[PDB]
A paper describes a structure:
A major player in this process is the UCS (UNC-45/Cro1/She4p) protein UNC-45, a myosin chaperone critical for the assembly of thick filaments. Specifically, UNC-45 was shown to promote the folding of the motor domain of myosin molecules. In this process, UNC-45 acts as a co-chaperone together with the general chaperones Hsp70 and Hsp908,11,12.
Like UNC-45815, the UNC-45717 molecule formed protein filaments in the crystal lattice using the same 4-helix interface to connect molecules. However, a pronounced structural change was seen in the UCS domain, a right-handed superhelix that was bent to different degrees reflecting two distinct conformational states. Structural alignment of the two states revealed a bipartite organization of the UCS domain. The disrupted interfaces between ARM repeats 12/13 and 13/14 appear to provide the conformational flexibility to allow for a 15° rotation of the C-terminal portion, a gross rearrangement resulting in a 10 Å shift of the C-terminal ARM repeat. Together, the crystallographic data underline the structural flexibility of the UCS domain, which can adopt discrete conformations. Strikingly, mapping the KRcanyon mutations on the structure showed that the corresponding lysine residues cluster in a well-defined region of the UCS domain, contributing directly to the interface of the N-terminal and C-terminal subdomains.
Author numbering: 7 to 469, 475 to 507, 525 to 557, 560 to 607, 622 to 913
């Protein structure tokens, strides 16, 4: 069974991509270093060569040293350890790694190329390294020591230091200062009167340096002589200042500690290594019992607590990307899950430790996906029965009579949350006969909380028998004099004549009484209305203005609300596979008027504001809304005017299954036709590179193909470095699609400027390589006429350019009846560009040699006589 999977890795390296191949060997190591001592080391050589193929040098070095461990006969292990130590920055070990491999096999040019680059590398490396130490020391003296100009010189000095670590791994080694950046950084966050931009840039340098492994792991060890106290401080670093963005960026230093102890995706799709996890399990129990223990700590703050909850969903779901199985269940088997339930009960009114209203999202989702990482067999049941025994622990203890009302609101708020996350167990609990009467008992009490949450409970239940109970109580509670209960109940009318909307308009149009959660439910109800309400909303201006202002005004829970607000009015979501035709609200020009007013009222800043949630399906909805804003007369300027694309690519990195593709086609429709230094200026042009890739991954059949071509048509019009960035992702399979299937497409004129310009090393090796004969032939056949003005010119320009090559002029003598049709369709045809485009193409064809100069004779003369007049 060992060999039967060992073959599949190397086959997977060459079948399509190595991105899938690297994990195959990683699965194949499960019986290694036990059942056999022959297969395990060589599979370690192949796996380390596999991650070396990607961009992971740390694991490749620590597996190449694992396979050298048996005898050191592996030569590819030495070439790989030296290739890793080359990019590692420490080229000294790479050189002695490579001299001991080239001495074993004197042949093979690559072993020589490594030593060739290493000679100059070690040669200059001491000079550049002492210059890097004077730059590191001059930088530390400026940003954090006695320096002038107050904020201005410091906030810039570190700003150069972050790039001194960020774009150079060798400079990343020198900014960390062998283990000295940390005390300076944490000494900065300790200043209560420090500008927070300085604090966030400092930590940003901090996580950058520890991105690797040991530099991060020493960041745990250095703080206390004994380990558990030393991981506490790293965890408890968010409990230092907590300004606004300080907590989000002090969170990633803790996130980075997960990436070290088990090696993880960081962003791009890479699986953790069990081999490191089992070694570092001691660290992971220590940090996760520390995050669990600080999850209920009263001293722990509001937002830093829910960022502490973000770390769990992002790390312990082994069916997504995190600690492997057996640790996902170590969390449920003890207090880790029972205590995890408790925080979902607490609400901004009843808590005991600070809790935010936003907590909702962060507490729903990590339970829901905990149902996704419990997709074993005894997992489903141990999870459910832990929740059922907690629910039984709460009903028997609530005694909603003698000041036990707090227990009844606690169980109610615990149940309202799980209808937002794990519905499979949440409806499983509202089966109980004790539930409905207690719900009713809160419904009529003078305790204003119990009634509000009461209407919130059944509006959460909106997807069987308890459902018919709660609706009548909802409408009888709608009349309530208090806004919290009327606004909390109006959602449930929409959740089942548009009479309610005339009150929904005044609910948010008057920004006086309603502010915090009051406006929030006022929008949530608005989201549940659809069908023809669209135009009735569009013909009011204060509706869009007040919805945008409400989303700008702390729209943290305004997520799915706005995302379904602008999506349903115009946008359409595709689904797997009479009434609409008569609709004058979402079908014809009214769909254009809806986005036309929606954008000019200012929906974009509300979108970038409410996108900060990790809600995958709300990410898909905001992506669909964003592409729906695009493809209109002046909308192309409107997207960039606030930053639609800049967060569109931000949502491409993490979205739902179709959310990445909706984001990708969204960026394509958004730009393209604007300008090359507008659709991705400066440092952002490279970020737009990746989304264009995997946009040809499916098939060239729908409207998603033509946009994917048209945006790349302008992606390479400026600067060569971008054209060389495109080559490293290999666009060849993509162009192969429209080479032999698309009929009505301008993509040929883009492929011309692609193959012609680009990097010299690539495009010279691409215009020539592979059977290009039919490519040259279609370069001539379509340049004749073909009822198109541009095809005849852009097709001809590559004829005039390629004619200049020496190897290329032998192959032109394969087709001769193609030249009468292009030489005639230049003087006789009515087009203007094709005449100058064709005459210059003919002259270079008659200037290469005399063998073809007589084969045409008259086809050229028909143009030469026409030119003189």
């Amino acid at each position: 069974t060992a060999e039967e999977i060992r073959d599949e890795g190397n086959a997977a390296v060459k079948d399509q991509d190595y991105i899938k191949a690297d994990e195959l060997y990683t699965e194949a190591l499960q019986l290694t270093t036990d059942e056999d001592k022959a297969l395990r080391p060589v599979l370690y050589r192949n796996r380390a060569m596999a991650r070396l193929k990607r961009d992971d040098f740390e694991g490749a070095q620590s597996d190449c040293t694992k396979a050298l461990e048996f005898d050191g006969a592996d030569v590819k292990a030495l070439f790989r350890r030296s290739l890793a130590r080359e990019q590692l920055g420490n080229v000294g070990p790479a050189f002695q790694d490579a001299k001991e491999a080239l001495r074993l096999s004197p042949n093979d040019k690559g072993i020589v190329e490594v030593l060739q680059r290493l000679v100059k590398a070690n040669n200059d490396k001491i000079k550049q390294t002492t210059s890097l130490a004077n730059k590191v020391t001059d930088m530390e003296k400026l940003a954090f020591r006695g320096e002038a100009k107050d904020t201005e010189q410091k906030m810039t000095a570190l700003n150069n230091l972050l790039v001194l670590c960020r774009e150079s791994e060798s400079g990343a080694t020198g900014v960390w200062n062998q283990g000295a950046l940390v005390p300076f950084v944490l000494n900065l966050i300790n200043d209560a009167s420090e500008n927070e931009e300085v604090t966030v840039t400092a930590i940003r340098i901090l996580d950058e340096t520890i991105k690797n492994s040991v530099r991060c792991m020493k960041f745990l060890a250095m703080h206390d002589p004994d380990g558990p106290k030393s991981v506490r401080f790293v965890c408890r670093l968010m409990c230092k200042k907590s300004t606004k963005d300080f907590v989000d960026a002090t969170g990633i230093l803790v996130q980075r500690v997960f990436n070290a102890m088990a090696k993880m995706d960081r962003q791009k799709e890479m699986k953790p290594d069990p081999e490191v996890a089992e070694a570092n399990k001691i660290w992971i129990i220590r940090v996760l019992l520390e995050l669990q223990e600080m999850l209920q700590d009263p001293k722990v703050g509001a937002v830093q607590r829910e960022t502490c909850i973000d770390l769990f969903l992002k790390n312990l779901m082994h069916m997504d990307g995190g600690i492997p199985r057996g640790w996902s269940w170590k969390f449920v088997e003890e207090r880790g899950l029972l205590a995890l339930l408790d925080v979902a009960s607490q609400i901004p009114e009843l808590c005991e430790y600070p809790v935010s209203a936003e907590t909702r999202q962060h507490v729903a989702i990590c339970l829901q996906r905990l149902e996704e990482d419990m997709v074993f067999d005894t997992k489903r049941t141990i999870f459910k029965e832990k929740v059922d025994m907690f629910f039984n622990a709460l009903i028997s203890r609530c005694t909603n009579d003698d000041e036990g009302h707090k227990y009844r609101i606690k169980l109610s708020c615990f149940l309202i949350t799980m209808l937002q996350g794990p519905v499979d167990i949440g409806i499983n609990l509202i089966t109980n006969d004790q539930l409905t009467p207690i719900m009713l008992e809160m419904a009529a009490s003078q305790d204003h909380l119990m009634q509000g949450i009461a209407a919130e409970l059944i509006v959460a239940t909106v997807s069987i028998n308890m459902l018919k109970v709660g609706i009548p109580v909802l409408r009888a509670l709608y009349d309530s004099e208090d806004p919290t209960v009327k606004v909390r109940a109006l959602v449930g009318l929409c959740k089942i004549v548009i009479s309610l909307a005339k009150t929904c308009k005044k609910f948010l149009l008057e920004t006086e009484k309603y502010s915090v959660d009051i406006r929030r439910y006022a929008c949530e109800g608005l989201s549940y209305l659809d069908a023809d309400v669209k135009e009735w909303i569009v013909d009011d201006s204060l509706l869009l203005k007040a919805l945008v202002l409400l989303a700008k005004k702390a729209g943290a829970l305004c997520v799915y609300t706005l995302a379904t607000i602008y999506a349903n009015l115009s946008n359409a979501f595709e689904k797997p596979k009479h009434v609409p035709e008569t609709h004058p609200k979402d079908t014809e020009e009214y769909v254009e008027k809806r986005v036309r007013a929606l954008v000019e009222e200012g929906a974009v800043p509300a979108c970038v504001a409410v996108s900060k949630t990790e809600s995958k399906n709300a990410l898909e909805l905001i992506a669909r809304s964003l592409l729906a804003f695009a493809e209109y007369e002046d909308l192309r300027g409107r997207i960039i005017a606030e930053g639609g694309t800049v967060l569109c690519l931000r949502l491409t990195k993490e979205a739902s299954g179709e959310g990445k593709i909706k984001a990708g086609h969204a960026i394509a429709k958004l730009g393209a036709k604007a300008d090359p230094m507008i659709s991705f200026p400066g440092q952002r042009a490279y970020e737009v590179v990746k989304p264009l890739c995997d946009l040809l991954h499916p098939d060239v059949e729908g409207k998603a193909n033509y946009d994917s071509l048209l945006t790349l048509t302008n992606l390479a019009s400026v600067s060569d470095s971008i054209r060389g960035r495109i080559l490293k992702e290999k666009a060849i399979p993509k162009i192969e699609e429209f080479w032999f299937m698309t009929d009505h497409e301008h993509l040929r004129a883009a492929a011309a400027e692609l193959l012609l310009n680009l990097l010299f090393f690539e495009k010279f090796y691409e215009e020539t390589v592979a059977p290009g004969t039919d490519r040259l032939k279609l370069w001539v056949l379509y340049s004749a006429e073909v009822e198109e003005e541009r095809l005849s010119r852009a097709s001809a320009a590559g004829f005039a350019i390629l004619t200049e090559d020496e190897n290329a002029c032998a192959r032109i003598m394969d087709e001769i009846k193609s030249w009468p049709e292009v030489f005639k369709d230049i003087a006789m045809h009515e087009d203007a560009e094709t005449q100058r485009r064709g005459l210059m193409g003919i002259a270079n064809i008659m200037h290469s040699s005399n063998k073809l100069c007589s084969e045409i004779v008259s086809s050229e003369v028909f143009r030469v006589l026409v030119a003189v007049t």
